[PDB]
Amino acid sequence: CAKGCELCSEVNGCLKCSPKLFILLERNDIRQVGVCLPSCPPGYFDARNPDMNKCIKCKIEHCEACFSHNFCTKCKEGLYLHKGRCYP
Ligand SMILES: [Ho]
Ligand SMILES: [Ho]
């Protein structure tokens, strides 16, 4: 498929990277394209699993982790997590 890509599509590029790499999915002109990166861009949480690592957009203030796009699942110490956002 490509460097570090274990599963790819002729249309959507990489869909599953090697376990050591992070998949970044970004939509281009009504199409989705996947890239395998050694780490995630700014504002993305580096979600890690035994079989798969993924960059999840996590532009939530005071947030430490997002399981799904822009929805916080763990706030910084001292903050209260409520419906994907963190509160003083
Ligand atoms: Ho803020
Ligand atoms: Ho933390």
Tell me the one-letter amino acid at 46: D
CA of 39 to the centre of ligand 1 (A): 26
Which among 35, 9, 32, 7 has a CA at the least distance from the CA of 21? Answer: 35
Cα–Cα distance between 47 and 30 in angstroms, integer? 25
Ligand at shortest distance from the CA of 86: 1
Q: Which two tokens stand for residue 68?
A: 């799904």
Residue found by looking up tokens 């890690």 in the block = 48
- Find the 75 Cα to ligand 2 centroid distance in Å: 7
How much distance in Å is there from the Cα of 19 to the middle of ligand 1?
35
How many angstroms does the Cα of residue 8 sit away from the middle of ligand 2? 35
**Method by which this entry was solved:** X-ray
Resolution, expressed in angstroms to one decimal: 2.0
- Domains, the chain, ranges and CATH? 1-88 (2.10.220.10)
Angstrom distance (rounded) from CA 27 to CA 34: 9
Neighbour tally for 74: CB within 10 Å: 14
